[PDB]
From a paper:
One of the β-glucosidases from Pyrococcus furiosus (BGLPf) is found to be a hyperthermophilic tetrameric enzyme that can degrade cellooligosaccharides. Cellulase systems consist of three categories of cellulase that catalyze the conversion of cellulose into glucose: endoglucanases (EGs), cellobiohydrolases (CBHs) and β-glucosidases (BGLs). BGL (BGLPf, family 1) isolated from Pyrococcus furiosus exhibits high hydrolytic activity towards cellooligosaccharides at high temperature. The structure of BGLPf shows a stable homotetrameric structure forming 222 point-group symmetry.
Here, a new monomeric form of BGLPf was constructed by removing the C-terminal region of the enzyme and its crystal structure was solved at a resolution of 2.8 Å in space group P1. The asymmetric unit exhibits a unique duplicated hexameric ring structure that includes the 12 monomers; one of the rings includes six monomers named A, C, E, G, I and K, and the other also includes six monomers named B, D, F, H, J and L. The arrangement of monomers therefore generates a local sixfold symmetrical axis that is not parallel to any of the crystal axes a, b and c, and hence the space group is P1. Analysis of the protein interfaces by PISA did not reveal sufficient interactions that could result in the formation of stable quaternary structures. Thus, the structures of monomers A, B, C, D, E, F, G, H, I, J, K and L are able to form a pseudo-dodecameric structure in the crystal, a complex that is presumably difficult to form in aqueous solution. The deletion of the C-terminal region of BGLPf, which drastically altered the crystal packing into space group P1, did not however affect the individual structures of monomeric BGLPf. Furthermore, the r.m.s. deviations of the Cα-atom positions (2–449) of subunits A, B, C, D, E, F, G, H, I, J, K and L of BGLPf-M6ΔC compared with subunit A of BGLPf-WT were between 0.44 and 0.71 Å, even though the region Asp96–Val108 showed a small mismatch of more than 2 Å. The results indicated that BGLPf-M6ΔC (63 kDa) is monomeric in aqueous solution. The hydrodynamic radius of BGLPf-M6ΔC was estimated to be 3.1 nm. Therefore, the results obtained so far demonstrate that thermostability is not determined by the C-terminal length of BGL, but rather depends on its polymeric state. We successfully constructed a monomeric form of the enzyme by removing its C-terminal region and solved the crystal structure. This study shows that the lack of the C-terminal region does not affect the activity of the enzyme, but disrupts its oligomeric state and hyperthermostability.
Residue numbers in the entry: 2 to 449
Write the structure that this text describes.
Amino acid sequence: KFPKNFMFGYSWSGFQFEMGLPGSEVESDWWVWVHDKENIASGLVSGDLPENGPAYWHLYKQDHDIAEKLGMDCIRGGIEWARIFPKPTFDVKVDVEKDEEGNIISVDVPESTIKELEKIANMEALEHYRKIYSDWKERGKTFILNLYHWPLPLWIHDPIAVRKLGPDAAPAGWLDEKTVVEFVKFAAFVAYHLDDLVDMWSTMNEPNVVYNQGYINLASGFPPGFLSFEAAEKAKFNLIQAHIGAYDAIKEYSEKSVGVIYAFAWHDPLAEEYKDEVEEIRKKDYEFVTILHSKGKLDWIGVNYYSRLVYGAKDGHLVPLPGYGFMSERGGFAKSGRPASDFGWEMYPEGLENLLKYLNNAYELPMIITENGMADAADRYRPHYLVSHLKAVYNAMKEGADVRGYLHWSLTDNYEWAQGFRMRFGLVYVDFETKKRYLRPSALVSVK
């Protein structure tokens, strides 16, 4: 048994879910990126398109109904910046204070600025977000809103251009210090308008995945797809600012818990001799969260756990080894003998149990499993994945970890970014031609 107040649910993100029937469609850096001819042709993206997705924007009522009757009481979803401000906000001026080193101290966004923003915002789309959030909230359920889930406005980031001409030649995204301010406006705008429907906030989702995959692991098919550690560091730095600033903006219009949602790989030493060196890596990997903790800008943490990384020696440097964790064979078995998801991600509930105790000891904050699931078209392993991983959470809690819920990823199949639709994470299958929902048997583990 889990505590009386422990929430069960799921999570969705705008890009992967909203689009699917005409009307839905929204220009963003990511959109352009998955439509780019060069990218599709070179195999760097699936060539699947998000406008062929599950169409949640229209079909949210059914999905909610399904989740409800599956006993779910909490959803964590998003709102898409590029959907709310298709047109730039730069001309709506705000007073911004900076120190010597070039840090952000404040960004005043009064009620009047919100009104000036209403003029150029898509209030049509905002109203639709209300309908969607209300549909769930008025059922007497909990909702968590996450402000950023990767796509940016085209007027913020043009990844094609950035890649061909370099960041000085186009809207550079999280490389332009300007982008942080505009995001802050966005945060305040959203707080002001939607707080009545939100129980808890998250400034952003997996920002570590964004800066690392976009500017270092080119193989990932993330934008803008060019190699530079300096770029990565800079993007990381501005994402930290964006969080801090958005935290202050939400607080100025809401009295609720604000946190962040983060990609927590569990790191494991192949051999006992590396144990120390691997803990050093844990620190570096989670540093993003460590930082925000130390500035007092985290009321809670969104844990997103899937698999692990195993480190060993190669030609003298210590690196993450193939055949383990996220680097296992797709639809096969890791070296450990654990099976892997269709994404080639090892099944490793142990990691989550270890992780939660690590994060509780390190931060002593309230946590929610804001993402946990697997790509399994066949529902071959999902049922065990679920039950094993819930057991892992339950164990961590017994040893003192403060965990207030679990949100699976996800209710329905959706658009797994550069991998298209071949990665299906849903407890509910979706026929992307008919947009029809059919539950996988694993969905009934949840009816409990």
